[PDB]
Amino acid sequence: MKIMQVEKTLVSTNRIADMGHKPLLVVWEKPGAPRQVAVDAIGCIPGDWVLCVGSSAAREAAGSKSYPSDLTIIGIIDQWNG
Amino acid sequence: MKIMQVEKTLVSTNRIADMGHKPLLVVWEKPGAPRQVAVDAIGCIPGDWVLCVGSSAAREAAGSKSYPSDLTIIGIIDQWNG
Amino acid sequence: MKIMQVEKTLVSTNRIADMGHKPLLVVWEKPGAPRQVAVDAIGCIPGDWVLCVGSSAAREAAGSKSYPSDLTIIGIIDQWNG
Amino acid sequence: GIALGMIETRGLVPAIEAADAMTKAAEVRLVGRQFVGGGYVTVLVRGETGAVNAAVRAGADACERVGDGLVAAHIIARVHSEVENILPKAP
Amino acid sequence: GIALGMIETRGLVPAIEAADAMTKAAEVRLVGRQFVGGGYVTVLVRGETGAVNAAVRAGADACERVGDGLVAAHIIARVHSEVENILPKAP
Amino acid sequence: GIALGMIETRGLVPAIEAADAMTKAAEVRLVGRQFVGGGYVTVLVRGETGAVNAAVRAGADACERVGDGLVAAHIIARVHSEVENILPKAP
Amino acid sequence: GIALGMIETRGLVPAIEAADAMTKAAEVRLVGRQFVGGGYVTVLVRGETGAVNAAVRAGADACERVGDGLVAAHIIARVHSEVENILPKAP
Amino acid sequence: GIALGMIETRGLVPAIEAADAMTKAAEVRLVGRQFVGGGYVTVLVRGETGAVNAAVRAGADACERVGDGLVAAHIIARVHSEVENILPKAP
Amino acid sequence: GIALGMIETRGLVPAIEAADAMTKAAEVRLVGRQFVGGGYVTVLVRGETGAVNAAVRAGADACERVGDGLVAAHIIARVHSEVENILPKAP
Amino acid sequence: GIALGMIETRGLVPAIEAADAMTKAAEVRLVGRQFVGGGYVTVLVRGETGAVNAAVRAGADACERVGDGLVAAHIIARVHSEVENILPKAP
Amino acid sequence: GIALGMIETRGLVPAIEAADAMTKAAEVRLVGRQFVGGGYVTVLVRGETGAVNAAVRAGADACERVGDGLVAAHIIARVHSEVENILPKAP
Amino acid sequence: GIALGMIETRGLVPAIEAADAMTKAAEVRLVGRQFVGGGYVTVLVRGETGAVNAAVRAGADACERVGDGLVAAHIIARVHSEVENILPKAP
Is residue G90 included in any domain, yes or no? no
Q: How far apart are CA I33 and CA I91, in angstroms?
A: 6
Nearest CA in chain D to B13: D50
**Chain H residues close to K49, C-beta within 8 Å:** 50
Q: How far apart are CA F62 and CA G39, in angstroms?
A: 40
The answer to the question of residue E76 being in a domain is yes
Resolution in A: 3.2
Q: Is H75 helix (H, G, I), strand (E, B) or coil?
A: strand
Q: Which of D20, D37, D67 sits opposite G72 (nearest CB)?
A: D67
Q: Answer whether L56's CB lies under 8 Å from L73's CB.
A: yes
Which of G18, G22, G26, G69 is closest to G48 using CA atoms?
G26
C-alpha–C-alpha distance, residues I46 and D15, integer Å? 46
Pick from B2, B72, B76: which is nearest to C37 by CB?
Answer: B2
CB contact (8 A) between residue C19 and residue B74 = yes
Q: How many separate domains does chain J show? A: 1
C-alpha E41/C-alpha E55 separation (Å) is 18
Cα–Cα distance measured from residue K47 to residue K28, given in angstroms and rounded to the nearest whole number: 5
* Rounded-to-integer distance, Cα B69 and Cα B57, Å: 9
Of F25, F48, F49, the CB nearest to D78: F25
Q: Coil, strand or helix: which one is J2?
A: coil
Phi, psi angles (nearest 5°) of residue F46: -125, 135
* Four-point Cα dihedral C4, C9, C13, C19, nearest 10: 40
Nearest 5°: phi and psi at I26? -130, 170
**Cα–Cα distance measured from residue G22 to residue G54, given in angstroms and rounded to the nearest whole number:** 8
Nearest to B45 among G49, G50, G80 (CB): G80
- Provide, as residue numbers in chain B, all residues whose Cβ is less than 8 Å from the Cβ of G78: 44-45, 48, 76
Contacts 24+ apart (CB under 8 A), F29-36: F29/F1, F30/F91, F31/F87, F31/F88, F31/F89, F31/F90, F31/F91, F32/F87, F32/F88, F32/F90, F32/F91, F33/F91, F34/F88, F36/F8
Rounded Cα gap, residues C54 and B55, in angstroms? 9
Rg (CA), chain I: 12
- Minimal CA separation from A62 to chain F, in Å: 19
Measured between beta carbons, the chain D residues lying within 8 angstroms of B13 are 50, 53
Specify whether the CB–CB gap between D24 and D82 falls below 8 A: no
Q: Are D14 and D70 in contact (CB under 8 A)?
A: yes
D91 found inside a domain: no
Across the beta sheet with G29-35, what order do the strands follow? Answer: G29-35, G40-47, G3-10, G70-76
Q: Helices F49-61 and D49-62 sit at what angle, rounded to 10 degrees?
A: 70
Distance CA L31, CA L34 (A): 10
CA-CA distance, C63 to C19, in Å (whole number)?
9
* Alpha helices, DSSP H, located in C1-82: 57-61
Complete DSSP assignment for A22-63:
--EEEEESSTTSPPEEEEESS---TT-EEEEE-SSHHHHHSS
Residue J80: what are its φ and ψ, rounded to 5°? -65, 150
User: Residue-wise over D24-61: b if at least 16 C-beta within 10 A, else e?
Assistant: bbbbbebbbbbbbbbbbbbbbbbbbbbbbbbbbbbbbb
Burial H26-47 (b: 16+ CB within 10 A, else e): bebebbbbbbbbbbbbbbbbbb
Chain centre to alpha carbon of residue H79:
15
- Contact list, G49 vs chain C (CB under 8 Å): 13-14
- Select from J16, J23, J24 the residue whose CB has the most chain C CBs within 10 Å, as the one to mutate to test that interface: J24
CA dihedral J56, J60, J66, J69 (to 10 degrees): 120
CATH number at residue D45: 3.30.70.1710
Q: I91 in a domain, yes or no?
A: no
How many Å apart are CA I6 and CA I33, to the nearest integer? 10
3-state secondary structure of E55: helix
Element (H, E) at K31: strand K29-35
Residue K24: name the closest of H2, H77, B44, H55 by CA.
H77
- The count of residues in chain G is 91
Phi-psi region of L37 (alpha: psi -120 to 50; beta: other; left: phi over 0): left
d(CA G49, CA C14): 8
**Experimental technique used to determine this entry:** cryo-EM
Confirm whether J91 is domain-assigned. Answer: no
Give, in degrees to the nearest 5, the angle at Cα D29 between D24 and D33.
95
Q: Are G67 and H72 in contact (CB under 8 A)?
A: yes
For residue B13, the chain F residues in CB contact (below 8 A) are 49-50, 53, 77
Query: Among K19, L8, L84, L62, which residue's Cα sits nearest to residue J10?
Result: L8
Alpha-carbon gap, residue H12 to I72, rounded angstroms: 9
Cα separation of the two ends of chain G: 17
Instruction: Give the up-direction half-sphere exposure of residue K73: CA atoms within 13 A in the CB hemisphere.
Output: 20
| Beta strand spans in H1-91 (E) | 3-10, 29-35, 40-47, 70-76
Q: Is residue D42 part of a domain?
A: yes
The verdict on B51 touching G (C-beta cutoff 8 Å) is no
K77 in any annotated domain: yes
Contact between residue L71 and residue L41 where contact means Cβ atoms under 8 Å apart: no
Per the structure, the complete domain to which residue L11 belongs is given by 1-85
Provide the b/e sequence for C31-63 (b: ≥16 CB within 10 Å): eeeebbbbbbbebbbeebbbbbbbeeebbebbb
Q: Is residue J35 part of a domain?
A: yes
Backbone angles phi, psi at G51, to 5 degrees: -75, -40
Specify whether the CB–CB gap between H19 and H59 falls below 8 A: yes
Phi and psi at J78, nearest 5°, equal -125, 125
- Spatial distance between the Cα atoms of F73 and F58, rounded to a whole number of angstroms: 11
**Residue I44 to residue F8: CA distance in whole angstroms:** 69
Task: Give the 3-state secondary structure of residue E64.
Answer: coil
Q: Smallest CA–CA separation between D47 and chain G, in Å?
A: 13
